[PDB]
Design a protein around this nucleic acid. Structure first.
Lengths: 54, 122, 118, 113, 214
RNA sequence: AUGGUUUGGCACCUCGAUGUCGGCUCGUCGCAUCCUGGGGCUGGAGCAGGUCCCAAGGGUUGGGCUGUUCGCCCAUUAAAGCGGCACGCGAGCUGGGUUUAGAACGUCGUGAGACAGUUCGGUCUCUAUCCGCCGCGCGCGUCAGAAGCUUGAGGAAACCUGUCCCUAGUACGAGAGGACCGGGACGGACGAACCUCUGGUAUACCAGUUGUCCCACCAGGGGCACGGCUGGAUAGCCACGUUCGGACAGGAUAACCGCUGAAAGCAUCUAAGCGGGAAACCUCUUCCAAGACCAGGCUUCUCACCCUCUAGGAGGGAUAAGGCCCCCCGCAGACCACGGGAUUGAUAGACCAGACCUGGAAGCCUAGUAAUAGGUGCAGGGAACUGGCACUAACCGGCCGAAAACUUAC
């Protein structure tokens, strides 16, 4: 089908504000004497030397 | 698990071979008929000069089915072919000899002359 | 093993089975492979069962392995080294390690290893 | 261990022979007629057996006056005072449902050796 | 005046009678519940009793719940439901702490159970509500299984609440009634209900003496 | 006089588009009621009825002909209701009819061509913005923050009926025939829940098998051919299957039957009062529900820190109880949610064993000319069900989250 009206500013921006993003929950790692912040999902793989840390 | 427009074989002397189910009696909107439920049914085949004639509308009972049927004991039955018996308003057969076996259900439906005429009830 | 609960892994059971066999081949050939996650989740059990056949070594076990993977060098590898090497370890030969996602489709990725601790 | 095993093993029926499909057999059934409890005999060919432990059941086909008759039973019922194998059977299958399409000398079975 | 108990569904099976009929019995393991608390017209304004069933290893329980259990003096348990009784009659037979056991019933006793149904997900009309769908041939342009119409035309011009539609069926509390009871096992703490009771094997039921028959 | 459904009258909105007969699916509403239920009168003996009043809760069949609505017929039924909502419903389906171009018959017309005459054929477009509706979430709120158990305003779902038996072959009646009331047993349609049985499905189970290519070859197996086909097929999902349900009673009532009794010396169900009384009504039955803003209740745990703005009231930190994210998963599931576990561990996968399904493996040996058969051997293989085992993974952790006061009564 097809809309019928020019859906307003309020409604538009309101719903548009649901299309957002969340940030992964970060955690320290003692990468060879120094520290970097990495998700928890990848913690073991970092401590074992696979994660490409730039 | 029988219906309308269903063809059945006869187990009688009446001079018919086949029949057609028109209704299933025992209520309204009755869909299925099991071993011991009356029907009303016409004729689609005959012997040469049988008493019955091709086009009659008679009343019948089912004695065999191909679909299974539980019993109280947890047992079952399954014949190969769907058969039936012409019967008159006092629940008496028209014929004199029954062919093939039947079920034990008919003794408890009060169809008992049939069971007396049956060779092998199972 | 326990079948896929839903739809399959590359478009059919055929492609799924072929894919699992190629990946077991590569695994036993190298020791590590990096692949998207549900492939690993699907490839732990397959591979552990092939390994168990290798452990319980025999002609019959060997043929019932060769009727999947199609690579004699890798079956020789199994029945020569990886079989006895995992004798006493009863169950649990593989390991999964999640890693950085993939650029093209954000898809998960995981490195599936064979353990080496006994 | 068949979770309801502790419910069923105290209700099973012992001494049921190890028979098998193809094994021809005659069954002594309890039946009630005219409010008397008497016994009947049913002969045939075991065409299956469906394990569940205590829910296990079997099926017997027979030829009656030109009409094929399968009769099913549960294995452990008190409605069975006897199950007596008469023969054995060489059959490659497990479920012998290919006997429905067959009549006469073709629906015969071999015996063991 | 209303004997109830909590239990766990296990499965189903068959057993036989003296007349050699067969009864499709469902099993329930009413493990011995415990009375945690009570409900009276002075304290709360109604008559009830509060029960407990299961096992927690003592660190999985929370501190509020541990207080609710240690204040009444007893140890923590998984599931805590509440029968609703009539008065002092049905209260004078209960005591805090006491262990209920399945023998409180007898063979032939008519019960009603309550349980959380099985889930089926986002269901269509032809599975929720048993609609005749539409034909599969004779010209159908893609309506083989979807409902049909939904109302009028400019009167009302709305949709008449409770109009039946697709959506999540299942996962609801359900009551199954007038079930006989075939056997009680005291050794193993088990009831052999007849019939077919709601839920998935490994859940929670609540059986009660039935209203119509008790 | 009604009702506004019928054929029509007016032509008031719509021709810069309001898509038209019937059928299907899906409803919901009215009662001027087809059955069930209560009842008054009879030219009502009894069984069946006829007419009238109240009454809408539920139910109100499948089939032949016709495009047809209507109708007629067959076979049943407790019964086979009348109508409205754009003659309900085509952004839901059909497209047989009617109403485009083709063609033919009859009749009219000199002819082109026409017929509320006929006959065969003939494209049915759209990603749902808003209201609405079925379900599901995030956020904030209910004067501290949180976790469990729940009351019930108010709403929803369900509500159908039959046949035989004793009552009694009694009442009744010349007889034929043939009961009320009230007790029972068994079933039809519908609805829910469940998978023990039956039956169906089974795209990583087993076996047989054809063609063909490959694994160097024989053997033994694999790939493709709709899973190549065929026989079977545990779990899960299901119905043809299983079990259960439709209560019983109670209050106020309609039509109605009345008791006591005047105005109106008697009389009268009423004007004051008192009663009985239906499937309808309110409770009872199952479900939801405190976002029920009168924002409930009974309980339990935490129930205590710091620095700023110039102390104005706020602000900003780190926290407890607790929750969330990440992780292992589920017979929970569109995602999210829901439920459980998270080394103080059996949640999952593996492994060992078992149950069940298939049906007697490979190799070797023997008999055979060869096809092949037999032994070792319930063999082997194998997925969900179950019990055990910590071997692998559930991590050496991040984020949210707690108290203006004021008055009477005390």
């Amino acid at each position: 089908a097809v809309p019928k009206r020019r859906m307003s500013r309020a409604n538009t921006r309101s719903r548009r504000a649901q299309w957002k993003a969340e940030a992964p929950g970060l955690v320290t790692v003692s990468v060879a004497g120094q520290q970097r912040k990495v998700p928890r999902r990848l913690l073991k793989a970092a401590r074992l030397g696979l994660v490409d840390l730039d | 698990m029988i219906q309308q427009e269903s063809r059945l074989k006869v187990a009688d002397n009446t001079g018919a071979k086949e029949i057609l189910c028109i209704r299933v009696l025992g209520g309204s909107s009755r869909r299925y008929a099991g071993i011991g439920d009356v029907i009303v049914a016409t004729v689609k085949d005959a012997i040469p000069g049988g008493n019955v004639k091709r086009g009659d509308v008679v009343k019948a009972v089912v004695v065999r089915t191909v679909k299974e049927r539980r019993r109280a004991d947890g047992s079952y039955i399954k014949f190969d072919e769907n058969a039936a018996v012409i019967i008159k308003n006092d629940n008496d057969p028209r014929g004199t000899r029954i062919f093939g076996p039947v079920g034990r259900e008919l003794r408890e439906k009060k169809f008992m002359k049939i069971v007396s005429l049956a060779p092998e009830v199972l | 093993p326990k079948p896929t609960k839903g739809p399959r892994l590359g478009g059919s059971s055929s492609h799924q089975s072929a894919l699992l066999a190629n990946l077991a081949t590569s695994l036993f050939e190298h020791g590590r492979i990096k692949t998207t996650e549900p492939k690993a989740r699907a490839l732990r059990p397959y591979a552990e069962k092939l390994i168990t056949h290798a452990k319980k070594g025999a002609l019959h076990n060997r043929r019932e392995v060769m009727k999947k993977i199609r690579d004699k060098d890798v079956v020789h590898t199994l029945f020569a080294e990886i079989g006895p090497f995992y004798a006493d370890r009863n169950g649990g030969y593989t390991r999964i390690i999640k890693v950085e996602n993939r650029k093209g489709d954000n898809a998960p990725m995981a490195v599936i290893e064979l353990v080496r601790e006994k | 261990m068949n979770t309801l095993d502790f419910v069923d093993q105290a209700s099973l029926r012992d001494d049921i022979p190890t028979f098998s499909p193809g094994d021809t057999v005659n069954v002594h059934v309890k039946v009630i007629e005219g409010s008397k409890e008497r016994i009947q005999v049913f002969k045939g060919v075991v065409i299956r057996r469906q394990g569940g432990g205590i829910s296990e059941t079997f099926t017997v086909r027979k030829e009656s006056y030109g009409v094929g008759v399968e009769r099913t039973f549960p294995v452990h019922s008190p409605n069975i005072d006897h199950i007596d194998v008469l023969t054995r059977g060489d059959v490659r299958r497990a479920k012998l449902y290919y006997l429905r399409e067959l009549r006469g000398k073709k629906a015969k079975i071999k015996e063991k050796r | 005046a209303r004997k109830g108990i909590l239990g766990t569904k296990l499965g189903m099976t068959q057993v036989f009678d003296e007349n050699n009929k067969v009864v499709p019995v469902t099993v329930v393991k009413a493990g011995p519940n415990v009375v945690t608390r009570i409900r009276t017209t002075e304290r709360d304004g109604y008559s009830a009793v509060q029960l407990a069933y299961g096992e927690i290893s003592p660190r999985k329980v929370i501190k509020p719940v541990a207080g609710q259990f240690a204040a009444a003096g007893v140890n923590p348990r998984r599931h805590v439901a509440e029968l609703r009784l009539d008065d002092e009659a049905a209260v004078a037979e209960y005591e805090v702490g006491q262990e209920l056991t399945a023998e409180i019933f007898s063979d032939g006793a008519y019960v009603d159970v309550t349980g959380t149904s099985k889930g089926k997900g986002f269901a269509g009309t032809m599975k929720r509500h048993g609609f005749r769908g539409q034909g599969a041939a004779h010209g159908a342009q893609a309506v083989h299984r979807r409902p049909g119409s939904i109302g009028g035309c400019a009167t009302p011009g709305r949709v008449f609440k409770g109009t039946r539609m697709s959506g999540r069926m299942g996962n609801d509390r359900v009551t199954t009634q007038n079930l006989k009871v075939h056997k009680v096992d005291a050794e193993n703490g088990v009831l052999l209900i007849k019939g077919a009771i709601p839920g998935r094997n490994g859940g929670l039921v609540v059986v009660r003496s039935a209203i119509k028959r008790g």
